[PDB]
Coordinates of C-alpha atoms in Angstrom, one line a residue:
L1 CA -40.7 2.6 -52.0
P2 CA -42.1 2.5 -48.3
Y3 CA -46.0 4.8 -48.2
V4 CA -44.2 6.5 -45.3
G5 CA -40.2 7.2 -45.8
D6 CA -37.4 7.8 -42.9
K7 CA -36.3 11.3 -42.0
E8 CA -33.9 13.0 -44.4
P9 CA -32.1 16.4 -44.4
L10 CA -33.5 19.1 -47.1
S11 CA -29.9 18.2 -48.8
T12 CA -31.5 15.2 -50.1
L13 CA -34.1 17.2 -51.8
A14 CA -31.5 19.8 -53.0
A15 CA -29.2 17.0 -54.3
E16 CA -32.3 15.6 -55.9
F17 CA -33.3 18.9 -57.7
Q18 CA -29.2 19.6 -58.6
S19 CA -29.9 20.1 -62.2
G20 CA -33.3 21.1 -62.1
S21 CA -34.8 24.2 -62.2
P22 CA -32.8 27.2 -60.8
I23 CA -35.8 28.9 -59.4
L24 CA -36.8 25.4 -57.8
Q25 CA -33.3 25.4 -56.2
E26 CA -33.3 28.5 -54.7
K27 CA -36.9 27.9 -53.5
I28 CA -35.4 24.3 -51.9
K29 CA -32.4 26.3 -51.1
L30 CA -34.9 28.5 -48.6
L31 CA -36.8 25.5 -47.7
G32 CA -34.0 24.3 -46.3
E33 CA -32.6 27.9 -43.9
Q34 CA -36.3 27.1 -42.0
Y35 CA -36.4 23.2 -42.0
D36 CA -34.0 20.9 -40.8
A37 CA -35.9 17.5 -42.5
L38 CA -38.0 15.8 -44.7
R39 CA -40.2 13.2 -44.8
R40 CA -41.6 11.9 -48.2
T41 CA -44.4 9.8 -48.7
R42 CA -44.8 7.0 -52.0
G43 CA -46.2 8.9 -54.6
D44 CA -49.4 6.9 -55.2
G45 CA -52.3 9.7 -55.4
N46 CA -52.6 9.4 -51.5
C47 CA -49.7 11.5 -50.5
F48 CA -51.9 14.3 -48.9
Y49 CA -53.5 11.6 -46.9
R50 CA -50.7 9.5 -46.0
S51 CA -48.5 12.5 -45.1
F52 CA -51.2 14.1 -43.2
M53 CA -51.9 10.9 -41.3
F54 CA -48.4 10.3 -40.5
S55 CA -47.1 13.5 -39.3
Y56 CA -50.8 13.9 -37.3
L57 CA -50.0 10.9 -35.7
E58 CA -46.4 11.6 -34.9
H59 CA -47.5 15.0 -33.5
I60 CA -49.5 13.1 -30.9
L61 CA -47.1 10.5 -30.3
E62 CA -44.4 13.2 -29.2
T63 CA -46.6 15.5 -27.4
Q64 CA -48.7 13.5 -25.6
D65 CA -51.6 16.3 -25.8
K66 CA -54.7 14.1 -24.8
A67 CA -56.5 17.3 -24.9
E68 CA -56.4 17.1 -28.6
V69 CA -57.3 13.6 -29.2
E70 CA -60.3 14.4 -27.4
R71 CA -60.8 17.2 -29.1
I72 CA -60.7 15.4 -32.5
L73 CA -62.5 12.2 -31.2
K74 CA -65.9 14.7 -31.0
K75 CA -65.0 16.0 -34.6
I76 CA -64.7 12.6 -35.6
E77 CA -68.1 11.6 -34.1
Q78 CA -69.5 14.8 -35.9
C79 CA -68.1 13.4 -39.3
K80 CA -69.9 9.8 -38.6
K81 CA -73.2 12.1 -38.5
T82 CA -72.4 14.3 -41.5
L83 CA -72.0 10.6 -43.6
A84 CA -75.0 9.2 -42.1
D85 CA -77.4 12.1 -42.7
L86 CA -76.3 12.0 -46.6
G87 CA -77.4 8.2 -46.9
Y88 CA -74.0 6.6 -45.8
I89 CA -75.0 3.4 -44.3
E90 CA -72.4 2.6 -41.7
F91 CA -71.1 -0.6 -43.0
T92 CA -69.2 1.5 -46.0
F93 CA -66.8 3.3 -43.4
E94 CA -66.9 2.1 -40.1
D95 CA -64.1 0.2 -40.5
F96 CA -62.1 3.5 -41.7
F97 CA -63.1 5.1 -38.4
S98 CA -62.3 2.1 -36.0
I99 CA -58.6 1.6 -37.3
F100 CA -57.8 5.2 -37.3
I101 CA -59.1 5.7 -33.9
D102 CA -57.2 2.8 -32.7
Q103 CA -54.1 4.3 -34.0
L104 CA -55.3 7.5 -31.9
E105 CA -55.3 5.4 -28.8
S106 CA -52.4 3.7 -29.4
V107 CA -50.1 6.6 -29.6
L108 CA -51.1 8.2 -26.7
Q109 CA -49.3 6.1 -24.0
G110 CA -49.9 4.6 -20.6
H111 CA -51.8 1.9 -21.2
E112 CA -51.3 -1.5 -22.6
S113 CA -52.1 -1.2 -26.1
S114 CA -49.8 2.1 -26.4
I115 CA -47.0 1.9 -29.0
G116 CA -43.8 3.8 -29.9
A117 CA -42.3 5.8 -33.1
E118 CA -40.8 2.8 -34.2
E119 CA -44.1 0.5 -34.7
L120 CA -46.4 4.1 -35.4
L121 CA -43.8 4.1 -38.6
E122 CA -44.3 0.3 -38.9
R123 CA -48.2 0.5 -39.1
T124 CA -47.9 3.8 -41.4
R125 CA -46.3 1.7 -43.9
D126 CA -48.5 -1.3 -43.6
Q127 CA -51.4 -1.4 -46.3
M128 CA -54.0 -2.7 -44.2
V129 CA -53.9 -0.3 -41.8
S130 CA -52.0 2.9 -43.8
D131 CA -54.8 2.6 -47.1
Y132 CA -58.1 2.3 -44.2
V133 CA -56.8 5.4 -42.4
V134 CA -56.5 7.4 -45.7
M135 CA -59.6 5.6 -47.1
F136 CA -61.0 7.3 -43.4
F137 CA -60.0 10.7 -44.6
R138 CA -61.1 10.5 -48.2
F139 CA -64.3 9.3 -46.4
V140 CA -64.6 12.3 -44.2
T141 CA -63.3 14.5 -46.8
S142 CA -66.1 13.7 -49.3
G143 CA -68.7 14.1 -46.3
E144 CA -67.4 17.4 -45.8
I145 CA -67.6 18.6 -49.1
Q146 CA -71.2 17.5 -49.9
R147 CA -72.7 18.9 -46.6
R148 CA -71.5 22.0 -47.6
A149 CA -72.0 21.4 -51.5
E150 CA -73.7 25.2 -52.3
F151 CA -70.9 26.4 -51.2
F152 CA -67.9 24.5 -52.6
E153 CA -70.3 23.9 -56.2
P154 CA -68.8 27.7 -57.6
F155 CA -65.1 26.7 -56.9
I156 CA -65.4 22.7 -58.1
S157 CA -67.0 23.7 -60.9
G158 CA -64.6 26.4 -61.9
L159 CA -61.5 23.7 -61.5
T160 CA -63.7 20.7 -63.1
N161 CA -66.8 21.1 -65.1
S162 CA -68.9 18.9 -62.7
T163 CA -71.1 18.6 -59.7
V164 CA -70.2 18.5 -56.3
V165 CA -71.4 14.8 -55.6
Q166 CA -69.1 14.4 -59.1
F167 CA -65.9 15.8 -58.0
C168 CA -66.7 13.2 -54.7
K169 CA -67.1 10.2 -56.2
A170 CA -64.2 11.0 -59.1
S171 CA -61.7 12.4 -57.1
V172 CA -62.3 12.1 -53.5
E173 CA -63.2 9.2 -52.5
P174 CA -61.2 6.8 -54.8
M175 CA -58.0 5.6 -53.9
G176 CA -55.0 7.2 -55.9
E177 CA -56.6 10.5 -56.8
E178 CA -54.5 12.9 -55.2
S179 CA -56.0 16.0 -53.6
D180 CA -55.9 19.6 -54.5
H181 CA -57.0 22.6 -52.1
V182 CA -60.4 21.5 -52.3
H183 CA -59.8 18.5 -49.9
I184 CA -57.5 20.3 -47.8
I185 CA -60.0 22.9 -46.6
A186 CA -62.7 20.3 -46.3
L187 CA -60.5 17.3 -44.3
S188 CA -58.9 20.5 -42.0
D189 CA -62.5 22.0 -41.4
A190 CA -63.7 18.4 -41.0
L191 CA -61.1 17.6 -38.5
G192 CA -60.3 20.7 -37.2
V193 CA -57.1 20.6 -37.5
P194 CA -54.2 23.5 -39.5
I195 CA -52.4 22.2 -42.3
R196 CA -49.5 24.5 -43.3
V197 CA -48.6 24.1 -47.1
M198 CA -45.5 24.9 -48.3
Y199 CA -45.3 25.1 -52.4
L200 CA -42.4 24.0 -53.9
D201 CA -43.3 25.6 -57.3
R202 CA -42.5 27.9 -60.5
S203 CA -44.9 30.7 -59.2
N204 CA -38.2 38.3 -56.2
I205 CA -38.2 34.3 -55.1
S206 CA -40.0 33.1 -52.4
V207 CA -41.6 29.8 -51.2
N208 CA -45.4 30.6 -50.8
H209 CA -47.3 29.0 -48.0
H210 CA -50.7 28.9 -47.0
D211 CA -52.4 27.8 -43.4
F212 CA -55.6 25.7 -43.4
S213 CA -57.6 25.8 -40.9
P214 CA -61.4 26.3 -39.8
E215 CA -60.4 29.8 -38.9
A216 CA -58.1 30.9 -42.3
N217 CA -61.3 28.9 -44.2
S218 CA -64.1 30.4 -42.8
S219 CA -65.5 33.2 -45.3
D220 CA -66.5 35.7 -42.8
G221 CA -62.5 36.9 -42.4
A222 CA -54.4 32.2 -35.4
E223 CA -51.6 29.8 -33.7
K224 CA -49.2 28.5 -36.7
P225 CA -49.9 25.2 -37.7
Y226 CA -48.0 22.2 -36.1
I227 CA -48.0 20.2 -39.5
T228 CA -46.3 21.7 -42.3
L229 CA -46.2 19.7 -45.9
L230 CA -44.7 20.0 -48.9
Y231 CA -46.6 20.5 -52.0
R232 CA -44.9 19.6 -55.5
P233 CA -47.2 18.0 -59.0
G234 CA -48.1 14.4 -57.4
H235 CA -45.9 15.1 -54.2
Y236 CA -47.3 15.3 -50.5
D237 CA -44.3 15.6 -48.2
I238 CA -43.8 16.2 -44.3
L239 CA -41.5 18.9 -42.9
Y240 CA -39.9 19.2 -40.4
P241 CA -39.1 23.0 -38.8
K242 CA -35.7 23.8 -36.9

């Protein structure tokens, strides 16, 4: 029931699908040879954003990579400008920006408002913080898609049969609309953080993956991502390499 779960061994995912498709069972087995743990998110249609929020903040907490925080803060500030250039007035998003930025600061150590791993998890489980951080990612993702509407247009109208702004208002901005590859391209482009997604689906049997990053998403043609997510229909969970 919590928004973000505790770390589990991959064997619990394996037990969960012990009567499932043999293809899925073998992919889970392959997953367990490279990954030590899994962290689930509640399946409410915000899983990609919620799993990204936790794994990213936890990554900063554990690495104390202050230079990475400074980098994303610069990107976050330019996400504010893309939203303003599209006509979003600041009161529509300012609370989403300030709450996420507060978590970025809180997870860096050495000042009055620093927090630890337990309080971070506590905050990602609190709706009045977790949902605001999710809405930040949704607004940042929506702005990046609209800013590059002409580039995204053929892909969105091949997937759906709607315009770009239609897609953003219907399936990016509202809470509970689960993310697809268009969300993940736009978010990783907007924030500049690579994301590895492992696909636990029915396609030799292997677990397909894709690395989303400003470099990999470029149409002209790096470092392995430090965020790894597991995708199933309706689910994005956090994977921990071994």
